[PDB]
Design a protein around this nucleic acid. Structure first.
Ligand SMILES: CCc1c(C#N)c(S[C@@H](C(N)=O)c2ccccc2)nc(N2CCC(N)CC2)c1C#N
Ligand SMILES: [Zn+2]
Ligand SMILES: [Zn+2]
Length: 842
DNA sequence: GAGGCCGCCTGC
DNA sequence: GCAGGTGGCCTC
């Protein structure tokens, strides 16, 4: 019933291989695809390509199965084409008895004309199926949710009869995962030194720079012990009655829990211990490095980093021995005086670049010169930016050097004007993108303004952030919400992608884009891209990890045309508060992460509010002067970068809103200490600038949950503080310095922590929003010391805008332009990944 | 036009 | 229970 076809081609040990076999009516050669029934008959069939056939002398006839992955098993889930399979690196040997049948599985290769085949309607993108036999077009990575073009690994001349792409690639992966040694330098008594070694695909030579975790070594400088603030001192509970609502010690925006950045070492010796016979123990690779001092690591503590470049190091003669496995990555560390180009052109010329000028001696606590033994393009993509705003994303991409935004669609006119101001020679459309795409599809050349419409082939990269009004909830889709989504700007954007078929595609959105409607918006977006034939993936980035003093998690969908390389997500550059760095995403109770490997540390120190705005001159509440004096040079590396090279005699848009007299009193009665907000307000009468009065907040009801003051006073300001009693309108009080509504509903809003909250110089911004309001959602918008709301220029700094980036409109328009924008440092990191792909194209 | 006011859901 | 994430709507 099961019989071989011929004699054996190769017999090794207990196995004997054959090329063709016969099962009960059928003949199978290596290369055919088959089906296998799981032990659970309710689960669907498994499908695999046979890669080898043989017989084991103690178990019987065997074959090697390289499994396919059903589309429902990918992140696409139920939205997958019911007949679409995906190549995966999964395989196993299995008895031929498990084979159920032979199935036809076709490879649907994109045509040479793929770029012109777009134009299918949203319904055909969302729900259209292929309508043929089993087919695959893409390889799938399950831990990163990456759909990519199938690998082109070639078969051996000695291992062709039994070759398996999956086995070959898994062996490649393991062999690059294990660290090895290379050209052997010199034999010593106790160890043997090498000139080079390799780890995770990176080549480390003697003299290269290594990233190490902060635990890898310590410095000879005594890390002088700071003092955590003693227990919260008791305050006058009748003067600051709401202070009791600060029983949590957690400070929003604080960097007290932010990790330390990497240690930087220079490889002095790569070496292995010798076995007693003299041969090296090459499974135990050690390295000897010279400790580099960051400025903040010298006897001058943290303040030494306020002015220094973020990549400035101090050479030292201290040394350390660590395990090679501890190396977190390679980096360049150059002596500045020997550098061919200037220090700025160097630092801006590539990743992981550090330089040193002086040398640090901890024993002497002095800076001297380092010993002598310490010495030794391509065309931009034409880009269409949909829902551009003032152009933060386009600016970041331009800074990466990959894009010229030739076309932008922005319906809000002041943001369109700002994008024009910053991007002359780009065509900015203010029409509905649906109207534009329909005009293009109808054969139109120009819009009603005379502007030339982008045609197929003009658009080489497509990026944008589409709003998600109507379906931004978590509840499941119904008919109404699904219709609103099918007629949505997200789907319109995908239609743009399908029509123009650019080389690269980026959808940016709020973090929760990945969870909307039980992750259905995400799943349908990926489904559309796959239906177009794109390679694609998704992930969540934290903008603060790329060089801004702000927590801003954004969702990122990346797509790359067939023939391209699918970009990686950018590795974090700066350490950041870990609680602001939850980037994982759960889809159908499966956890996906990105390719990011820097989880606990990083190469650059975190950017603080001090780095962001310590150089801006003091202004009053309601500052309106559009052009003022900086009153001095930039102070931090970040300020030098954003102010730029050419000297700027004018500081622009350092204006603030003119909050009312009551709000101004409140603000100037918020303490300057970190973590201060409305709960530290005093309960006093105060006369306002308009001569009116602000009265005490009187406590009129017993909150049995929160109790009473140390003086015995009540803590409720309304009858609703009782069990089921409703709001007595007479209990509402007006023109109180302590706003009445915050104690009124604070028990169910985490005591409205952060409202009327000050920023911290050592800390970061909460998410920069379109209109900073101290009693709104994100109400931590007060200046660290000045009695005002954060300014437009300060918000721009928190978003990482260059100071020369022109805005447009009134102050609320400009706040909104800044708030809506993608932080250019984040956009630039993504763009550099895209550039990697552009450079590494076959 | 600007300020007071403040639900519902999720991950832990 | 705590922290985070989403602005909009009466009202004068
Ligand atoms: C934290 C303060 C707050 C916010 C905020 N940020 C909202 S955003 C909500 C809406 N406003 O529609 C919305 C939902 C979906 C999309 C866009 C906006 N909503 C709040 N609620 C007050 C009573 C209102 N009827 C609605 C619920 C509160 C509070 N407190
Ligand atoms: Zn295999
Ligand atoms: Zn009430």
């Amino acid at each position: 019933r099961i019989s071989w076809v011929g004699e054996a081609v190769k017999t090794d040990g207990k196995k004997s291989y054959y090329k063709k076999v016969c099962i009960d009516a059928e003949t199978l050669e290596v290369g055919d695809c088959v089906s296998v029934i799981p032990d659970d008959s309710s689960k669907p069939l498994y499908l695999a390509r046979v890669t080898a056939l043989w017989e084991d002398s103690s178990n019987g006839q065997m074959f090697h199965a390289h499994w396919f992955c059903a589309g429902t098993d990918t992140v696409l889930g139920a939205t997958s084409d019911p007949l679409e399979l995906f190549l995966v690196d999964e395989c196993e040997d299995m008895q031929l008895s498990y084979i159920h049948s032979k199935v036809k599985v076709i490879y649907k290769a994109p045509s040479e004309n793929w770029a012109m085949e777009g134009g299918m309607d949203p319904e055909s993108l969302l729900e259209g199926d292929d309508g043929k036999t089993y087919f695959y077009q893409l390889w799938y990575d399950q831990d990163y949710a990456r759909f990519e073009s199938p690998p082109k690994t070639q078969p051996t001349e000695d291992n062709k009869f039994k070759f398996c792409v999956s086995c070959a690639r898994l062996a490649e992966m393991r062999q690059k995962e294990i660290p090895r040694v290379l050209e052997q330098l010199e034999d010593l008594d106790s160890r043997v030194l090498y000139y080079s070694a390799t780890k995770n695909g990176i080549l480390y030579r003697v003299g290269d720079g290594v990233y190490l975790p902060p635990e890898a070594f310590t410095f000879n400088i005594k890390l002088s012990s700071p003092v955590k603030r003693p227990r919260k001192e008791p305050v006058d509970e009748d003067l600051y009655p709401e202070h009791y609502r600060k029983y949590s010690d957690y400070i929003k925006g604080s960097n007290l829990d932010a990790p330390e950045p990497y240690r930087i070492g220079r490889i002095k010796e790569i070496f292995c211990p010798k076995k007693s016979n003299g041969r090296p123990n090459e499974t135990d690779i050690k390295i000897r490095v010279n400790k580099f001092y960051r400025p903040e690591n010298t006897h001058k503590s943290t303040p030494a980093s306020y002015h220094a470049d973020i990549n400035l190091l101090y050479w030292s003669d201290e040394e350390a021995v660590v395990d090679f496995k501890a190396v977190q990555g390679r980096c360049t560390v150059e002596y500045g005086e020997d550098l061919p180009e200037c220090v700025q052109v160097y630092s801006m010329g590539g990743p992981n670049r550090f330089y040193f000028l002086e040398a640090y001696n901890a024993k002497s606590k002095s800076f001297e010169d380092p010993p002598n033994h310490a010495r030794s393009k391509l065309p931009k993509l034409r880009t269409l930016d949909v829902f551009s705003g003032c152009g933060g994303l386009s600016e970041g991409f331009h800074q990466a050097g990959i894009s010229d935004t030739l076309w932008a669609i922005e319906m809000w006119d002041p943001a369109a004007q700002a994008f024009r101001l910053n991007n002359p020679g780009s065509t900015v459309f203010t029409e509905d993108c649906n109207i534009l795409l329909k005009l293009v599809m109808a054969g139109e050349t120009t819009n009603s303004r005379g502007q030339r419409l982008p045609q197929k082939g003009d658009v080489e990269m497509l990026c944008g952030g589409p709003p998600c009004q109507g379906f931004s909830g978590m509840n499941r889709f119904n008919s109404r919400t699904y219709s609103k989504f099918k007629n949505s700007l997200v789907v319109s954007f995908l239609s743009y992608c399908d029509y123009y078929r650019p080389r690269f595609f980026l959808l940016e959105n709020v973090r929760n884009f990945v969870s909307f409607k039980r992750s259905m918006v995400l799943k349908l977006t990926l489904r559309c891209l796959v239906r177009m034939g794109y390679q694609c993936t998704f992930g969540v980035l934290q903008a603060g990890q790329y060089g801004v003093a702000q927590t801003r998690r954004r969702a990122i969908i990346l797509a790359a045309a067939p023939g391209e390389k699918l970009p990686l997500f950018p590795e974090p550059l700066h350490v950041f508060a870990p609680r602001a760095c939850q980037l994982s995403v759960v889809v159908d109770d499966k956890k996906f992460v990105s390719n990011i490997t820097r989880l606990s540390s990083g190469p650059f120190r975190t950017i603080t509010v001090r780095d962001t705005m310590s150089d801006l001159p003091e202004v009053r509440n309601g500052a309106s002067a559009l052009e003022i004096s900086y009153n001095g040079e930039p102070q931090s590396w970040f300020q030098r970068q954003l102010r730029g090279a050419q000297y700027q005699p004018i500081l622009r848009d350092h204006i603030c809103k003119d909050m009312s007299a009551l709000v101004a009193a409140r603000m100037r009665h918020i303490p300057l200490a970190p973590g201060s907000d409305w709960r530290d307000l005093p309960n006093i009468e105060v006369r306002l600038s308009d001569g009116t009065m602000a009265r005490k907040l009187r406590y009129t009801h017993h909150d049995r949950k929160n109790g009473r003051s140390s003086s015995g006073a009540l803590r409720g300001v309304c009858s609703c503080v009782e069990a089921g009693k409703a709001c007595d309108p007479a209990a509402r009080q007006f023109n109180t310095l302590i706003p009445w509504c915050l104690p009124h509903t604070g028990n169910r809003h985490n005591h409205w922590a952060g409202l009327y909250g000050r920023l911290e110089w050592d800390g970061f911004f909460s998410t920069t929003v379109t209109n900073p309001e101290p009693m709104g959602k994100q109400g931590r918008v007060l200046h660290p010391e000045q009695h005002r709301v954060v300014s437009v220029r300060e918000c721009a700094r928190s978003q990482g805008f260059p100071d020369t980036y022109r805005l447009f409109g009134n102050i609320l328009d400009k706040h909104r332009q800044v708030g809506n924008a993608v932080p250019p440092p984040l956009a630039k990191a993504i763009g550099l990944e895209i550039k990697l792909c552009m450079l590494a194209k076959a």
